[PDB]
Enzyme design. Structure first.
Site, PDB file in Angstrom:
ATOM      1  N   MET A  89       0.765  -1.252   0.000  1.00  0.00           N
ATOM      2  CA  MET A  89       0.000   0.000   0.000  1.00  0.00           C
ATOM      3  C   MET A  89       0.803   1.314   0.000  1.00  0.00           C
ATOM      4  SD  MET A  89      -3.205  -0.802  -0.069  1.00  0.00           S
ATOM      5  CE  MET A  89      -4.528  -1.887   0.443  1.00  0.00           C
ATOM      6  N   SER A  90       2.088   1.278  -0.355  1.00  0.00           N
ATOM      7  CA  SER A  90       2.904   2.497  -0.319  1.00  0.00           C
ATOM      8  C   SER A  90       2.398   3.690  -1.126  1.00  0.00           C
ATOM      9  CB  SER A  90       4.351   2.204  -0.755  1.00  0.00           C
ATOM     10  OG  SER A  90       4.433   1.954  -2.162  1.00  0.00           O
ATOM     11  N   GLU A 121      15.577  -5.474  -6.194  1.00  0.00           N
ATOM     12  CA  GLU A 121      14.202  -5.376  -5.666  1.00  0.00           C
ATOM     13  C   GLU A 121      13.462  -4.311  -6.497  1.00  0.00           C
ATOM     14  OE1 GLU A 121      14.630  -6.197  -0.813  1.00  0.00           O
ATOM     15  OE2 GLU A 121      13.326  -4.650  -1.664  1.00  0.00           O
ATOM     16  N   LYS A 178       7.452   4.151  -6.949  1.00  0.00           N
ATOM     17  CA  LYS A 178       7.553   5.352  -6.098  1.00  0.00           C
ATOM     18  C   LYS A 178       7.699   6.649  -6.920  1.00  0.00           C
ATOM     19  CE  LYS A 178       7.741   3.001  -2.217  1.00  0.00           C
ATOM     20  NZ  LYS A 178       7.250   1.809  -2.975  1.00  0.00           N
TER      21      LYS A 178
END
EC number: 3.4.21.88
Lengths: 111, 197
Positions: free
Chosen positions: B117-118, B151, B155
């Site tokens: 949920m970032s 990873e 964002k």
């Protein structure tokens, strides 16, 4: 192929949604932002009248359509938002016309 | 036309090598990775793939393999990404969705399943299918797909000298700080839309 209600048509496989989507609707406002349904989004809808409490539905309250979470108890119908700044809507089946247009089954955002 | 199990493994290795290096593998690399008895054995499978039209073989310089029929209708869906593998490695592809790529601008090249949920404050939720345009040309303030020591994450971009800060849109989260002097970092693409099902 999904129609926008006809105002337009989009080539998105209706079967990517379960139950399957019958049409798309343009969302207005931020009343459902906490679960990711934003102003300008296209909501995928399955046409039906059989829904239950907790599900996100499309309802018509006397000539006006809205998208909210359902909480019904007999003749008392509450349409709840997912945004702390919005008031819940209360409807009495005995006084005003109320109709379930469908169940929300997805979203498409391409601003 | 249908590829046998072994022909599929050779074809998958060729595509993964190109996706990671932009260059095809040698016959020796194929035999070594798939445990074939010798380079001759690898050549036989390559002949069958060319015959079935998925590749072209050109005599001459080393690494003379070319992919054919690359254009596909719709969009492939990328799931969980493994370390030491390119984003579009075949093992990451879960399926192909019939969705018009031109509905998004710039056009979408693939869909990526979102984890966590970032970015919920702007409506990108756990499980959503993010539409992505493959590119390395991005700018500060745009929502991007990036890889930190392999990873993958989604964002907002904020370049900071020899460091890069990747910002969230959720009050419970804080920025990811990347130090380019000791961590690997790459931009995979630009987010252009979302499909939630």
């Amino acid at each position: 192929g999904l129609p926008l209600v006809i105002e337009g048509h989009y080539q998105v496989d209706p079967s990517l949604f379960k139950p399957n989507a019958d049409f798309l609707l343009r969302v207005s406002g931020m009343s459902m932002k906490d679960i990711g349904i934003m102003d300008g989004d296209l909501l995928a809808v399955h046409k039906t009248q059989d829904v239950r409490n907790g599900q996100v539905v499309v309802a018509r309250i006397d000539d006006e359509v809205t998208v909210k979470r359902l909480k019904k108890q007999g003749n008392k119908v509450e349409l709840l938002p997912e945004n702390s700044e919005f008031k819940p809507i209360v409807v009495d089946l005995r006084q005003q016309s109320f109709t379930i247009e469908g169940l929300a089954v997805g979203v498409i955002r391409n601003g």
